[PDB]
Design a binder for these strands. Structure first.
Ligand SMILES: Nc1ccn([C@H]2C[C@H](O)[C@@H](COP(=O)(O)OP(=O)(O)OP(=O)(O)O)O2)c(=O)n1
Ligand SMILES: *[C@@H]1c2c(cc3ccc4cccc5ccc2c3c45)[C@@H](O)[C@H](O)[C@@H]1O
Ligand SMILES: [Mg+2]
Ligand SMILES: [Mg+2]
Ligand SMILES: [Mg+2]
Ligand SMILES: [Mg+2]
Length: 432
DNA sequence: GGGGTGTGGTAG
DNA sequence: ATCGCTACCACACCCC
């Protein structure tokens, strides 16, 4: 066990943290895109007619972890057994669950202890360990296959297991659903072959928002072609409110409050007005949802097609550690901040930037919260505090940055024993 | 309008 | 045990 005051803590935590991997992978894919396409000026204009193929692996970690499993799990069956990927056996996050598990209401992000409860008697949850190197290898095969096809004007990385692929259609070429369906079947077979048995699903549409919804409809192991002209009651009735991009749990609560708890997006489509939406969830998000219900992309969403090189540029850099934070005194907190700053500065130097503004943010145990929460080493319920500082001159100097971060910690007035998380942020980045 | 800071939501 | 990251938007609120 590597404690938070051990010099190896950050390394160990990031080696084990799947959410660290998700973010680091996305950042590296964006950086790859910027390097690979430096002499490929294949950005979309609003003149162009295009088709979107939104492609992602089915239950990615579970599939890959299953295919690469040890001989101890040789008889375990992906099509018949509920299978999850996680670290532990009780209050440990299910990173990915297969579609058998999902038939019982098990979801990604549920703790194993919750998921076990949802299975009937006679049915055992199979837990597999993370295989991070294999996740990366399968992703490499995925992106290689997409490039090798030589069919997309733009391949935009969304995650380790997910890409938005854009085909521009000339005016003189007539594109048909048959051609679109053949391409879906080609991609699916080629990825299945190239990854040695992982499945992908594909949503195919003439808008980003619809391609994403079509993808959800296609899962698992399928494809769906739904263009704006094909929108129907049956389609919209297949989706929950938080199936919309940008709508998570908090926005869902607001929409259920305002619109008398619509069961599906069809119910919301029947009941809403634009003015009422905007009042429920704000001007920008309201317009996004309204446009989404017509199968249309908001202007913010379209920027990634119109200028991907600008959109994928990194504008800030940070680390977040809100697990395993148990410090006894301020000396240890300071040493940890120093280690974090050292880490961040290596990243800042790799991208040849300086920073002109930094923030320290912390999580402090809520007054009424137990000293140790149900998840081992978890932050539990906390209040956040943050403070920022502008640096006179842009810098990458440890002496300046680490000293200011430590000073920021002191200003926030959190006793070390109550600290449950720290984030160190470089908010503004500057060239050379 | 120009400038600023702190908090919280979402995606993967 | 268990590994609750992190970029970036939107917003509420302050100043001249
Ligand atoms: N709450 C989550 C969500 C996702 N992931 C990781 C594991 C997932 O396998 C991977 C990709 O996420 P997706 O949301 O596409 O989820 P899956 O690929 O697991 O399932 P789906 O078949 O729903 O796409 O990211 C995670 O660790 N925790
Ligand atoms: C940790 C977890 C879970 C649910 C929520 C819900 C709302 C949250 C708001 C802000 C922070 C936060 C941090 C962790 C959370 C949150 C929130 C559960 O899905 C589960 O217990 C997770 O492990
Ligand atoms: Mg997915
Ligand atoms: Mg997936
Ligand atoms: Mg994904
Ligand atoms: Mg959503």
């Amino acid at each position: 066990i590597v404690a938070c005051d051990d010099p190896d803590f950050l390394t160990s935590y990031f080696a084990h943290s799947r959410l660290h991997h998700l973010s680091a992978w996305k950042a590296n894919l964006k950086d790859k895109f910027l390097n690979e396409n430096i002499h490929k000026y294949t950005k979309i204009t609003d003149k162009d007619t295009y088709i979107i193929f939104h492609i992602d692996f089915d239950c990615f970690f579970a599939t890959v972890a299953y295919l690469c499993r040890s001989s101890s799990f040789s008889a375990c069956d992906f099509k018949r057994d509920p299978i999850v990927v996680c670290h532990g056996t009780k209050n440990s996050d299910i990173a990915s669950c297969n579609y058998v598990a999902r038939s019982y209401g098990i979801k990604n992000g549920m703790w194993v202890s919750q998921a076990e409860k949802m299975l009937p008697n006679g049915i055992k949850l199979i837990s597999l360990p993370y295989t991070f190197e294999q996740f990366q290898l399968k992703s490499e095969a995925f992106y290689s296959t997409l490039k090798r096809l030589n069919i997309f004007n733009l391949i935009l990385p969304i995650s380790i297991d997910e890409a938005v692929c854009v085909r521009i259609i000339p005016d003189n070429i007539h594109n048909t659903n048959t051609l679109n369906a053949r391409l879906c079947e080609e991609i699916r077979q080629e990825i299945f072959q190239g990854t040695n048995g992982c499945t992908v699903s594909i949503g195919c549409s003439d808008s980003l928002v619809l391609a994403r919804l079509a993808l959800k409809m296609a899962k698992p192991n399928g494809y769906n072609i739904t263009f704006k002209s094909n929108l129907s009651e049956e389609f919209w009735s297949s989706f929950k409110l938080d199936d919309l991009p940008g709508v998570g749990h908090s926005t869902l609560s607001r929409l259920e409050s305002t619109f008398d708890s619509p069961h599906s997006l069809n119910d919301l489509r029947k009941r809403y007005t634009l003015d009422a939406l905007k009042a429920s969830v704000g001007s920008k998000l309201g317009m996004k949802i309204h446009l989404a219900l017509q199968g249309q992309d908001d202007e913010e969403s379209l920027k990634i097609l119109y200028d991907p090189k600008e959109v994928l540029q990194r504008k800030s850099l940070s680390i977040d550690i809100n697990w395993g934070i148990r410090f006894k005194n301020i000396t240890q907190v300071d040493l940890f901040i120093e280690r974090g700053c050292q880490y961040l500065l290596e990243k800042l130097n790799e991208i040849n930037k300086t920073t002109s503004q930094i923030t320290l943010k912390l999580m402090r145990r809520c007054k009424d919260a137990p000293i140790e929460p149900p998840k081992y080493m978890g932050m539990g319920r906390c209040d956040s505090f943050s403070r920022s500082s502008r640096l006179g001159i842009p810098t990458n100097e440890f002496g300046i940055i680490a000293t200011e971060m430590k000073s920021l910690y002191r200003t926030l007035g959190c006793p070390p024993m109550e600290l449950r998380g720290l984030a160190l942020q470089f908010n503004k980045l500057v060239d050379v």
